[PDB]
């Protein structure tokens, strides 16, 4: 005889962070489309974070990213081909620099998605962080057109919001793409357009930067006769909409009563 309705050994039950779940789902969505996930370093060179992406200093466009500038020596920032690069250190303001690193280290055609923690000097409120996550996308190859960028996002939406979802593209500006664009997806439930991220056809100058850096490293040009599209989307804003989180500050808050709430989710 035993009271079988009696509690059992208190073995701990784990869980994954909301961002991990969201990032995972996103990565799966694109894996099904032939994209592979790779990461980049959080501490970057001004060259990779800005210059290589067609974003020079004193440029009005560089104001789109409030940079955290770093200092200190003894630190070894390593480049794409493992080599020891230089440049003013800073915390990457977006995952974009990674599409330059990847391109100098591989050859087209290819599909990549790169998730990552990004940093920006900004005031932390209920829907704004200085430390958040993005998910970049980059598909390069001969004959790649903007019709493909639009199809990718269409697929992203369907996968994220169902058959009654739909995408919308509006021209927007980014120094690393041309044509450039911002896209929104239709959220049937909340019944409204969510501005998800920006995108566009990789910029001529970005390809040139890649090949120039390649030469300097002894590699042969690989992006002379190919085109490609890239995109980037904020993760928290989407995780919040999706998991119904009211305050973006929770993610990095570390509160268990909060985190524990996502054990179930997948």
């Amino acid at each position: 005889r035993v009271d079988v309705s009696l509690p059992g050994a208190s073995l701990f039950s784990g869980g994954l962070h909301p961002i991990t779940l969201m990032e995972r789902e996103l990565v799966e969505i694109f894996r099904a489309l032939g994209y592979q996930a790779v990461e980049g370093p959080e501490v970057e060179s001004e060259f990779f974070n800005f210059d290589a992406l067609n974003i020079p200093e004193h440029h009005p466009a560089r104001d789109m990213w409030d940079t955290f500038w770093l200092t200190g020596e003894g630190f070894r920032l390593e480049g794409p081909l493992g080599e020891e690069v230089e440049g003013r250190l800073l915390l990457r303001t977006h995952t974009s620099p990674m599409q330059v690193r990847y391109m100098v280290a591989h050859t087209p055609p290819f599909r990549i998605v790169v998730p990552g923690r990004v940093f920006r000097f900004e005031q932390t409120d209920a829907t704004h962080e200085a430390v958040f996550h993005q998910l970049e996308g980059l598909v390069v190859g001969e004959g790649i057109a903007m019709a493909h960028l639009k199809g990718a996002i269409y697929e992203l939406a369907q996968a994220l919001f169902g058959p009654d979802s739909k995408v919308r593209f509006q021209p927007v500006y980014f120094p690393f793409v041309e044509p450039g664009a911002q896209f929104a997806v239709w959220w049937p439930e909340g019944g409204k357009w969510l501005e998800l991220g920006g995108a566009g056809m990789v910029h001529p100058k970005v390809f040139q930067a890649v090949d120039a850096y390649r030469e300097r490293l002894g590699l042969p040009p690989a992006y002379r006769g190919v085109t490609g599209f890239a995109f980037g989307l904020g993760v928290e804003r989407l995780a919040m909409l999706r998991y119904g989180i009211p305050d973006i500050r929770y993610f990095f808050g570390g509160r268990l009563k909060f985190l524990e709430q996502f054990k179930g989710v997948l």
Partner: protein, 785 residues
């Protein structure tokens, strides 16, 4: 099928080698499972002529006087050893494969055997060893080395798929090679027929079974051994030469997938009758086996006056009595097309699988009979000096194959290739197809020998194989999948996570056969298995499992017997059967438990599993609860059902002792649930910024009352501001009224918007103490610090 290189090379002269051939057949759709070199014959073996045979008095041996260049004697015990035939003479000193030791001059029963005459097995050309090889007395100049007329051969062991029955004929194979571009040589049936009546009639009483049936007439037969080239050919193909006529029929069969049989006219009587067998009918078939026919068996019979008697098992094997032998002078030649299904059933029915049945089961050229008769009769005229009649006896009139619409554009579209139209039509033509019209869609009518060509798709595969599957480029498709295909993988993905979380929690996955032993139904105390096997691998695997745990309990024992595990935490996900096929998840615990290897205190048994299971569902974000309930296969004291998110999904408990004993096992704990588990949708619960209220209290309840009910009531009554509620201590005895016990509960309260006033709390702690006693329960200590 055995494919002798030199034989095939007779139809396809330009063949490069057996290696290149193997390659060509691979691309044509025929895989060779082996290549063998086969007739090594030492120089010591020579051709000889038996001038005379003399039996040794008192023995059952014979003294053969052989012309082997010079005259030599040899002793033989072979029944067929007679004068007038040619034999393979292995001279003293010869190294024969079949014996290992050297051949020599030896004394046997008074005579000096100068070497010995060989049998197929001794020369090593066939497995047969019950008689001498019999050659034509003039096959060669006495004493010439046999190699000089019997070279080694290379034989390919070819796989011939059911769709290509035409390939069960060497000439059929030749045609495919021709389509590739090789020149094709078809044998010419030079016949010198004689217009005269056939001394017998044909009466096909069952056209269902014998759709097309012909009979040839050859007389003036001089039965004798086959030429060396034919014996070599037949041996290489796995068959054994018998004589002139019989060999010609096997040769032609092997040549053009057309079984045929020569009936000695001595036994035919007034005519051949193709009919079903009368129940009980007997027949001693060619394999010397005395059989009894089933009324569903098609039979080749003869009749004389008012009597009808079986002659052979139509399309399977001929009778022993009508078999063509040395004294035969005339025959009736059967060349037909039998009903595949019929042959199929008869063949099975009697456990016979013959070169003939095989081909009829796979199908024969519905209009190949007449051409086959010429080939055979021609050969019979050449090798047996047969005088052939001009007419045949025919019954049935098959219709030619119909035209098939063919579009070179579709061929290229389906394959993803871009072969020019002309190239395609030429291929088709080489395969013997007729092509009419000028496109874009053609009228392509195949050769009657291609049973496998009926659809346009069938024709595009012809183009592909002759062009070569390697000429089809590689590509990847792009497209937006149709809407009803979205998230179609959710289910599969859901169960995968489950397995993965389990393996991460500590459970070891195990795969157990889906079968079941009908007895275990009784052993493990379960209702009987609903599905059974009409043809099990064994009676222990005669049913389909109804539960997943029995297989686990078994693997446990088997693991204790081979190796000796101290513990074991297993799990298995599998399809179970009963009313409906359903997916189950089952787990099993066993052994000492969790603790310190060098220490002693440990965590195990029921509550160890129950705890591990609590984590699982905690991880899956689902409500887990175990209420007591009985289960035949469980321990009455350690038994309860499982309630995931309210609904009952399975059970959990200790394996009933008696079972443990019959199986000689320690206490085994386990569970089994039904998948898929429920889905609890997220409903984010924004945490409260404010502090929580902490208060303790014990509930005095009789030992029998389940913890579950108490907890349920306490929570239910704790009000809408209850945060936690955990049992931190269970006690019973002095000073409490024995048969009772106290439950130490840790309680928490919290308000989303503001803090809670002592009024709200101490009052809520009363709303409970109220219904707590109103339900018949005490309160060892209220508002406990």
């Amino acid at each position: 099928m055995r494919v002798p290189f030199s034989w095939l090379k007779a139809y396809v002269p330009e063949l490069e080698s057996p290696e290149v051939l193997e390659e060509r057949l691979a691309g044509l759709g025929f895989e060779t499972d082996r290549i063998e070199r086969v007739f090594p014959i030492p120089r010591g073996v020579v051709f000889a002529r038996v001038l005379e045979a003399h039996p040794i008095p008192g023995t059952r041996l014979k003294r053969l006087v052989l012309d082997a260049g010079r005259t030599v004697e040899v002793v033989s015990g072979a029944e067929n050893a007679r004068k007038g035939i040619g034999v393979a003479l292995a001279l003293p000193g010869t190294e024969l494969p079949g014996l290992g030791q050297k051949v020599g001059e030896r004394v046997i029963q008074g005579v000096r055997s100068f070497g010995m005459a060989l049998s197929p097995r001794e020369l090593g050309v066939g497995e047969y060893g019950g008689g001498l090889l019999e050659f034509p007395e003039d096959a060669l100049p006495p004493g010439t080395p046999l190699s000089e007329a019997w070279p080694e051969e290379v034989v390919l062991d070819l796989e011939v798929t059911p769709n290509r029955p035409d390939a069960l004929g060497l000439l059929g194979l030749a045609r495919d090679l021709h389509a590739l571009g090789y020149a094709l040589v078809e044998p010419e049936a030079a016949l010198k027929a004689e217009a005269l009546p056939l001394p017998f009639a044909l009466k096909v009483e069952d056209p269902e079974g014998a759709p097309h049936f012909t009979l040839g007439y050859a007389f003036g037969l001089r039965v004798a051994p086959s030429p060396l080239w034919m014996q070599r050919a037949l041996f290489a193909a796995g068959m054994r030469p018998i004589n002139n006529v019989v060999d010609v029929t096997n040769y032609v069969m092997l040549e053009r997938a057309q079984p045929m049989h020569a009936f000695d006219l001595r036994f035919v009587g007034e005519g051949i009758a193709v009919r079903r067998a009368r129940e009980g009918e007997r027949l001693k078939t060619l394999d010397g086996v005395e059989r009894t026919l089933h009324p569903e068996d098609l039979v080749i019979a003869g009749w004389r006056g008012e009597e009808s008697f079986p002659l052979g098992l139509a399309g399977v094997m001929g009778g022993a009595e009508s078999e063509v032998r040395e004294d035969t002078e005339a025959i009736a030649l059967e060349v037909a097309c039998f009903d595949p299904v019929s042959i199929r059933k008869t063949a099975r029915r009697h456990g016979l699988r013959t070169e003939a049945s095989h081909r009829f089961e796979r199908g024969v050229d519905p209009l190949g009979q007449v051409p086959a008769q010429r080939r055979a009769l021609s050969l019979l005229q050449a090798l047996a000096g047969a005088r052939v009649a001009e007419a045949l006896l025919e019954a049935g009139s098959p219709k030619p194959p119909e035209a098939i619409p063919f579009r070179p554009e579709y061929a290229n579209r389906l394959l993803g290739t871009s072969y020019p139209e002309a190239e395609q039509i030429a291929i088709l033509k080489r395969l013997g197809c007729r092509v009419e019209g000028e496109g874009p869609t053609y009228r392509v009518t195949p050769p009657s020998h291609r049973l496998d060509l009926r659809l346009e798709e069938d024709l595009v595969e012809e183009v592909a194989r002759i062009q070569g599957y390697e000429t089809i480029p590689l590509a990847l498709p792009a497209f937006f999948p149709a809407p009803d295909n979205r998230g179609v993988e959710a289910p599969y993905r859901k169960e995968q996570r489950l397995r993965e979380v389990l393996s991460g929690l500590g459970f070891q996955e195990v795969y157990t056969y889906s079968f079941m032993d009908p007895e275990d139904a009784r052993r493990f105390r379960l209702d009987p298995p609903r599905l059974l096997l009409l043809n099990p691998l064994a009676p222990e695997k005669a049913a389909l499992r109804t539960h997943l745990f029995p297989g686990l309990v078994r693997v446990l024992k088997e693991n204790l017997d081979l190796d000796r595990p101290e513990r074991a935490l297993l799990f298995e996900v599998g399809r179970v059967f009963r009313e409906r096929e359903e997916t189950h998840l089952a787990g099993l615990l066993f052994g000492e438990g969790v603790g310190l290897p060098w220490a002693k205190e440990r965590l195990s048994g029921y509550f160890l599993l129950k705890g591990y299971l609590e984590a699982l569902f905690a991880r899956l974000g689902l409500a887990f609860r175990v209420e007591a309930q009985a289960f035949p296969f469980l321990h009455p004291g350690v038994s309860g059902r499982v309630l995931v998110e309210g609904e009952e999904v399975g059970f959990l408990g200790a394996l009933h002792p008696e079972i443990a004993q019959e199986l000689e096992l320690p206490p085994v704990h386990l569970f089994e649930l039904r998948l898929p588990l429920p889905d609890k949708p997220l409903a984010f619960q924004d945490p409260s910024r404010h502090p929580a209220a902490f208060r303790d209290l014990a509930v005095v309840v009789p030992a029998p009352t389940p913890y579950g009910e108490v907890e349920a009531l306490v929570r239910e009554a704790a009000g809408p501001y209850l945060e936690s509620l955990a049992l931190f201590d269970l006690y019973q005895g002095p000073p409490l009224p024995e048969g009772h016990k106290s439950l130490a509960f840790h309680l928490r309260f919290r308000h989303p918007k503001r803090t809670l006033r002592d009024e709200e709390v101490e009052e809520a702690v009363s709303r409970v103490a109220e219904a707590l006693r109103a339900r018949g329960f005490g309160l060892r200590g209220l508002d406990t610090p």
